[PDB]
Design an enzyme around this catalytic site. Structure first.
Site, PDB file in Angstrom:
ATOM      1  CG  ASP B  25      31.283  20.497  46.060  1.00 27.49           C
ATOM      2  OD1 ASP B  25      30.662  21.269  47.323  1.00 27.49           O
ATOM      3  OD2 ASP B  25      31.672  19.441  46.753  1.00 27.49           O
ATOM      4  CB  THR B  26      31.675  26.698  44.828  1.00 31.11           C
ATOM      5  OG1 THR B  26      30.262  26.259  45.648  1.00 31.11           O
ATOM      6  CG2 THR B  26      31.716  26.920  42.956  1.00 31.11           C
ATOM      7  N   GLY B  27      32.011  23.591  47.166  1.00 25.42           N
ATOM      8  CA  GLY B  27      32.016  24.128  49.066  1.00 25.42           C
ATOM      9  C   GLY B  27      33.006  22.452  49.530  1.00 25.42           C
TER      10      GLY B  27
HETATM   11  C1  LIG Z   1      27.667  14.508  47.548  1.00 28.31           C
HETATM   12  C2  LIG Z   1      28.807  15.572  47.666  1.00 28.31           C
HETATM   13  C3  LIG Z   1      29.300  16.744  48.479  1.00 28.31           C
HETATM   14  C4  LIG Z   1      30.277  15.420  49.568  1.00 28.31           C
HETATM   15  C5  LIG Z   1      28.056  16.947  49.604  1.00 28.31           C
HETATM   16  N1  LIG Z   1      28.332  17.760  50.492  1.00 28.31           N
HETATM   17  C6  LIG Z   1      29.134  19.005  50.348  1.00 28.31           C
HETATM   18  C7  LIG Z   1      30.390  19.532  50.223  1.00 28.31           C
HETATM   19  O1  LIG Z   1      30.296  20.742  49.043  1.00 28.31           O
HETATM   20  C8  LIG Z   1      30.619  19.610  50.777  1.00 28.31           C
HETATM   21  C9  LIG Z   1      30.007  20.564  52.391  1.00 28.31           C
HETATM   22  C10 LIG Z   1      31.533  20.749  53.463  1.00 28.31           C
HETATM   23  C11 LIG Z   1      32.224  21.727  53.677  1.00 28.31           C
HETATM   24  C12 LIG Z   1      33.222  22.185  54.973  1.00 28.31           C
HETATM   25  C13 LIG Z   1      32.488  21.114  56.183  1.00 28.31           C
HETATM   26  C14 LIG Z   1      31.558  19.615  55.522  1.00 28.31           C
HETATM   27  C15 LIG Z   1      30.868  19.919  54.326  1.00 28.31           C
HETATM   28  N2  LIG Z   1      32.174  19.764  51.001  1.00 28.31           N
HETATM   29  C16 LIG Z   1      33.102  18.381  51.397  1.00 28.31           C
HETATM   30  O2  LIG Z   1      32.583  17.388  52.196  1.00 28.31           O
HETATM   31  O3  LIG Z   1      34.540  19.026  51.135  1.00 28.31           O
HETATM   32  C17 LIG Z   1      35.152  18.328  51.504  1.00 28.31           C
HETATM   33  C18 LIG Z   1      36.114  17.947  50.410  1.00 28.31           C
HETATM   34  O4  LIG Z   1      36.909  19.071  50.564  1.00 28.31           O
HETATM   35  C19 LIG Z   1      36.632  19.431  52.110  1.00 28.31           C
HETATM   36  O5  LIG Z   1      36.990  21.123  52.286  1.00 28.31           O
HETATM   37  C20 LIG Z   1      35.970  20.913  53.069  1.00 28.31           C
HETATM   38  C21 LIG Z   1      35.400  19.549  53.823  1.00 28.31           C
HETATM   39  C22 LIG Z   1      35.906  18.512  52.772  1.00 28.31           C
HETATM   40  S1  LIG Z   1      27.324  17.535  52.107  1.00 28.31           S
HETATM   41  O6  LIG Z   1      28.223  18.447  52.963  1.00 28.31           O
HETATM   42  O7  LIG Z   1      27.847  16.611  52.675  1.00 28.31           O
HETATM   43  C23 LIG Z   1      25.757  17.725  51.904  1.00 28.31           C
HETATM   44  C24 LIG Z   1      25.444  19.265  51.545  1.00 28.31           C
HETATM   45  C25 LIG Z   1      24.064  18.678  51.030  1.00 28.31           C
HETATM   46  C26 LIG Z   1      23.367  17.745  51.127  1.00 28.31           C
HETATM   47  C27 LIG Z   1      23.704  16.922  50.950  1.00 28.31           C
HETATM   48  C28 LIG Z   1      25.368  16.655  50.834  1.00 28.31           C
HETATM   49  O8  LIG Z   1      23.198  15.693  50.028  1.00 28.31           O
HETATM   50  C29 LIG Z   1      21.743  16.395  50.122  1.00 28.31           C
HETATM   51  O9  LIG Z   1      21.704  17.676  50.473  1.00 28.31           O
END
Ligand SMILES: CC[C@H](C)CN(C[C@@H](O)[C@H](Cc1ccccc1)NC(=O)O[C@H]1CO[C@H]2OCC[C@H]21)S(=O)(=O)c1ccc2c(c1)OCO2
Lengths: 99, 99
Positions: B25-27
């Site tokens: 998960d690059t995000g």
């Molecule tokens: C179910 C798998 C993931 C948790 C899904 N998320 C994408 C993540 O990449 C998200 C993307 C993200 C990034 C920043 C803020 C909010 C969401 N990152 C995230 O939650 O990371 C957390 C852990 O590391 C921390 O750094 C960033 C937030 C914390 S998401 O943003 O909730 C998401 C995105 C598109 C989607 C989805 C969910 O459901 C369908 O399409």
């Protein structure tokens, strides 16, 4: 290009006629953009992540350019804290994970 | 390997001697795993995602083998929807985005 992950993989995208910074996010099935008043028909949707769900508007067949590469597809609009480019568009611009 | 994104980039990890499936998960800045027992000290932390904030347990300097590649780093344990490998460990295994 090659994008390392020392920092958040933020890139410039263009949608409607706005330029925005968005994450290239392999963990996102769908593309989710910060609240913007996009024209067109949409459908309501909920998407889940860390913390719970948010309500978004699903717009289809929306052209987006991602770092100079053209894409067109579904974009979700809602109160996300960050613009997220999901796998639906990442495949379209030829993006892979490599290690 | 090179991993395309028409499917979720799920991989097998080994942690605390157990095999699990996790999402590259690059995000995600951080690595967050579903409820589990890990040895040693942890500390209370909070993290925010798309849906709000959750409480997690922070374990530092934990070995995990991700698709055959070794990392040792911080692992957060809490109510994430799915096991996610974030950039703190993706960088250790030499993972980049390419298009
Ligand atoms: C179910 C798998 C993931 C948790 C899904 N998320 C994408 C993540 O990449 C998200 C993307 C993200 C990034 C920043 C803020 C909010 C969401 N990152 C995230 O939650 O990371 C957390 C852990 O590391 C921390 O750094 C960033 C937030 C914390 S998401 O943003 O909730 C998401 C995105 C598109 C989607 C989805 C969910 O459901 C369908 O399409």
């Amino acid at each position: 290009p090659q994008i390392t992950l020392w920092k958040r993989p933020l890139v410039t995208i263009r949608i409607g006629g706005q330029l925005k910074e968005a994450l290239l996010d392999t963990g996102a099935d769908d593309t989710v953009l910060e609240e913007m008043n996009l024209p067109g028909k949409w459908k309501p949707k909920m998407i889940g992540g860390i913390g719970g769900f948010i309500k978004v508007r699903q717009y289809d067949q929306i052209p987006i350019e991602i770092c100079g590469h053209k894409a067109i597809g579904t974009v979700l609009v809602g109160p996300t804290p960050v613009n997220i480019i999901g796998r639906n568009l990442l495949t379209q611009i030829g993006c892979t994970l490599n290690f």
